[PDB]
Design a protein around this ligand. Structure first.
Ligand SMILES: CC(C)NC(=O)N(C)[C@H]1CCS(=O)(=O)C1
Length: 165
């Protein structure tokens, strides 16, 4: 199962790891993607997960959007996990750089509650522009299922652990 994680709460765990390498190693039931409403996996976690699938995630995602239209900010969809996981839960956190409501971050984390265990990044962190400390706080106060957070940046990981209330 998951190894090397620091336990933050009863159900939240955290590790300084590349989520792509972590997914290839564990092959979890669910890997969370930091998706946008269009499922255009260009950069950040989405670009990295998509590149690891040899673009199969993007091909599947374009068919999903052609059939269903865009997701809502705060929403999600379950697609294949390809070579990384059984499923990928594409979750749209608000992008502060796009002027999206940070209050939608709790709605985005609520999607995790539909899955017993997930490998995930911090929603709205990185290129989405939100404060990762705030994202971790919303995660622990919203997610009740078992979440294993992978934080790519060592310096941010140390700051998140050392400042965790
Ligand atoms: C069976 C899965 C989808 N749901 C799940 O594990 N739940 C969300 C439980 C975790 C604690 S609770 O929120 O009280 C009920």
């Amino acid at each position: 199962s998951f190894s090397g994680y620091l336990k933050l709460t009863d159900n939240v765990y955290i590790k300084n790891a590349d989520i792509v390498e972590e997914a290839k190693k564990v092959k979890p039931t669910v890997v969370v993607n930091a998706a946008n409403v269009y499922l255009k996996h260009g950069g950040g976690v989405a670009g990295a997960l998509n590149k690891a699938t040899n673009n199969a995630m993007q091909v599947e995602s374009d068919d999903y959007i052609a059939t269903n239209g865009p997701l809502k900010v705060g929403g999600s969809c379950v697609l294949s996990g390809h070579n990384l996981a059984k499923h990928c839960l594409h979750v749209v956190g608000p992008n502060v750089n796009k002027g999206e409501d940070i209050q939608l971050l709790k709605s985005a984390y609520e999607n995790f509650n539909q899955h017993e265990v997930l490998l995930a990044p911090l929603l709205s962190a990185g290129i989405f522009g939100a404060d990762p400390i705030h994202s971790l706080r919303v995660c622990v106060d919203t997610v009740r299922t078992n979440v294993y957070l992978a934080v790519f940046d060592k310096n941010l990981y140390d700051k998140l652990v050392s400042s965790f209330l």
